Amino acid sequence: TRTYDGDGYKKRAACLCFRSESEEEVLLVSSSRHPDRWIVPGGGMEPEEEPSVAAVREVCEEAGVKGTLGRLVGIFENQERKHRTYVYVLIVTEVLEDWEDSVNIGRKREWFKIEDAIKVLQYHKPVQASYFET
Numbered sequence: 809t810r811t812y813d814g815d816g817y818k819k820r821a822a823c824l825c826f827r828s829e830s831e832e833e834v835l836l837v838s839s840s841r842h843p844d845r846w847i848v849p850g851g852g853m854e855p856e857e858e859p860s861v862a863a864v865r866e867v868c869e870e871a872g873v874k875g876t877l878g879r880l881v882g883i884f885e886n887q888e889r890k891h892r893t894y895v896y897v898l899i900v901t902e903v904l905e906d907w908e909d910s911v912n913i914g915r916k917r918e919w920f921k922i923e924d925a926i927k928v929l930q931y932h933k934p935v936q937a938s939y940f941e942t
């Protein structure tokens with residue numbers, strides 16, 4: 809069930825999934841519509857679901873990782889698609905071999921240096937590239 813802010817923006821949460829507390833390498837996943845493209849894992853908040861809980865759930869489902877939830881980076885809007893995403897830091901400590909989206913849609917995941925994550929996100933996901941700006 810999709811959820812919405814009072815202005816009709818779809819509510820989402822995502823994590824920047826870093827290998828370590830150095831925050832030098834981040835985990836991206838393949839787009840569902842266009843698997844040769846990369847995105848930051850994330851998705852819709854469920855009814856009454858805390859944003860931090862949605863963020864951790866979505867990255868388990870999409871990226872097959874778990875770890876130590878860190879700070880909220882910020883809340884980011886996509887004007888064209890009308891959604892508003894809470895973006896958290898997650899320090900990955902568990903990498904699961906088979907995860908929901910690997911099994912269901914053959915979703916891929918890959919580690920990127922921050923500068924390379926920004927590069928591959930820029931064309932189709934410039935707001936997600938902006939997650940990294942600070």
Ligand SMILES: O=P(O)(O)O[C@H]1[C@H](OP(=O)(O)O)[C@@H](OP(=O)(O)O)[C@H](OP(=O)(O)O)[C@@H](OP(=O)(O)O)[C@H]1OP(=O)(O)O
Binds near residue numbers: 810820841842847889
């Ligand atoms: O229309 P697309 O380009 O395929 O994009 C879709 C769409 O995102 P937009 O809202 O930016 O269009 C989905 O959202 P809904 O249509 O379900 O509201 C989203 O699902 P989430 O917001 O829950 O992530 C899904 O992404 P995914 O399959 O990664 O969950 C994402 O496709 P991509 O981001 O993979 O291209």
Ligand SMILES: [Cl-]
Binds near residue numbers: 827829830831834
């Ligand atoms: Cl790192």
Ligand SMILES: [Cl-]
Binds near residue numbers: 886933
């Ligand atoms: Cl976006």
Ligand SMILES: [Mg+2]
Binds near residue numbers: 849850851852870
């Ligand atoms: Mg998603």
